[PDB]
Design a protein that fits this description.
The structure is a homodimer. By secondary structure, chain A is an alpha+beta fold. The first copy, chain A, has 7 helices and 8 strands, in the order H-H-H-H-E-E-E-E-H-E-E-H-E-E-H. In chain A, the strands form 3 sheets. Chain A has a 3-stranded antiparallel beta sheet with strand order 2-3-4, with no helix packed on it. The interface between A and B is large, with 23 and 48 residues. The structure holds zinc ion (ZN) (4 copies). The site of one zinc ion (ZN) has 8 residues of chain B, from loops. Chain B: Homomultimerizes on viral ssDNA bound to pTP. Forms a initiation complex with viral polymerase, pTP and hosts NFIA and POU2F1/OCT1. Interacts with host SRCAP. Chain B: It comes from Human adenovirus C serotype 5. Chain B: GO terms for molecular function: DNA binding; identical protein binding; single-stranded DNA binding; zinc ion binding.
């Protein structure tokens, strides 16, 4: 119950000393993720001063840890708030690291080449340009993109060798700080980055070596924000949260990150709606 | 007086750096708006890069703002002209949003039939030009505009039934056809299935509750690329008030004429002969 989660919420805030106010006003509502992101911030600066991230900003990491915490704390209280998904993430069973050279966009269909990979619905659109039916996926160098996909998968395996399911799925944020209506993409941008130093040079550390690229998520349309987190670090956020919970509680509750299902809802927007400009006048026109 | 507004303008022109050529040529005369439009595009680019138009020619947008500023400059300087209206617009009290399923043309006559047209079109020279291939499609647009306006003016004691409509395009600023811009309903595709419990911005909720908006175009799409949606035209006016209220604090008086149906708006079906210039003193040779 809400009260049940409230107790669990209280504790974490006391232990990791959350500002006297935030805890006093935290009532467990969907928009209340500052105190949660705060308990994580201290626990990090206290128990993990040596966390080196890769293509991730500290704000994004502490932010994400908050979401996954809210998830657990909610899963623990058996609370579901309509029109709200705690994680701000979904699991995309991508099929990019399967057929050599082939990638498949968010639609679950192949990507039409233009070596560049474009979502098939941008057929008319000139390469890196999107239609209102697009999912907003594009890759300049298609090979790199796959290397990044192979990497996250390699990493995922190293961390979970005896998994019965999961190595094909992709943990990915569905909303950046912007959408937490606007034109352009509707989900954080997925961009592959390369690790030149790895090229030369612990199974998970070898993942980056064997596949010198990394999936990085930024803002939807870099409205734009400084959101940035690489996939593997995003996994480590989910993980660190699990441990933080396990340090404070005997059993870890089920937290189901929704599996990604395509929807028009995530379609690239090309047309805007009017937003009124501000006027101090009471009446519209003079008579 | 002329000196005052002439000074208020060169002040606004220098500030937003309009080409010295236009700066000189300007004189607060009836159809001088290029310079003003310029002051407007610059001001927009400088302090409003995030502006976004829905079915509106960018050019059409600064043109309208130019007109509204000209209106202001003129009133401010108290300089009127025998046959000119700076705004180039009128306040049509449309009754198309009041009675469910009812639309009415400029004449003030219900529109008759799927499609709905002017009563004198069951175009005839006694028509106003108004026609709608789909009734609902059309009314959905008229509803939205009322919604947007109510939002932007919640305490408005009067004006939600009116419509800021333009009277001329870059064609008539006689000639055959519709004697004013063409009003054509355009549906808002993405809004159709959007949760109306999104955020606290009501004006957007208007487009959400009524996914389709009125777009004004050329009198006869000689024809021009005049394109501007109802809400953007209202914003043209609003933003000019902003621009002005910044530099002069108190905004002057400026009444946009109210629409009164009259023959000069009837569909023109027959031309009136125009004499071709002849460089002769006498027409014939005997
Ligand atoms: Zn796609
Ligand atoms: Zn963003
Ligand atoms: Zn009529
Ligand atoms: Zn025209």
């Amino acid at each position: 119950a809400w009260e049940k989660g409230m107790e669990a919420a209280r504790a974490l805030m006391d232990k990791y000393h959350v500002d006297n106010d935030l805890k006093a006003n935290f009532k467990l509502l969907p928009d209340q993720v500052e105190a949660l992101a705060a308990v994580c911030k201290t626990w990090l600066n206290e128990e993990h001063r040596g966390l080196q991230l890769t293509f991730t900003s500290n704000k994004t990491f502490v932010t994400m840890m908050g979401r996954f915490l809210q998830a657990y704390l909610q899963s623990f209280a058996e609370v579901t708030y309509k029109h709200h998904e705690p994680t701000g993430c979904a699991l995309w069973l991508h099929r990019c690291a399967e057929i050599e050279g082939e990638l498949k966009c968010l639609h679950g269909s192949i990507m039409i080449n233009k070596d560049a990979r474009c979502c098939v619905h941008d057929a008319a659109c000139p390469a890196n340009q999107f239609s209102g039916k697009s999912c907003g996926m594009f890759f300049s160098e298609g090979a790199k993109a796959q290397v990044a996909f192979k990497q996250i998968k390699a990493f995922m395996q190293a961390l979970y060798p005896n998994a019965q399911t999961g190595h094909g799925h992709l943990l990915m944020p569905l909303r950046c700080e912007c959408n937490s209506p606007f034109l352009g993409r509707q989900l954080p941008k997925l961009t592959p980055f390369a690790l030149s130093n790895a090229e030369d040079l612990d199974k998970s550390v070898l993942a980056s070596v064997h596949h010198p690229a990394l999936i990085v998520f930024q803002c939807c349309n870099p409205p734009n924000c400084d959101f940035k987190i690489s996939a593997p670090d995003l996994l480590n956020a989910l993980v660190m949260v699990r441990s933080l919970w396990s340090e404070n509680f005997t059993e870890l509750p089920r937290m189901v990150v929704p599996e990604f299902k395509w929807s028009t809802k995530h379609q690239y927007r090309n047309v805007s709606l009017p937003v009124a400009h501000s006027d101090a006048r009471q009446n519209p026109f003079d008579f």
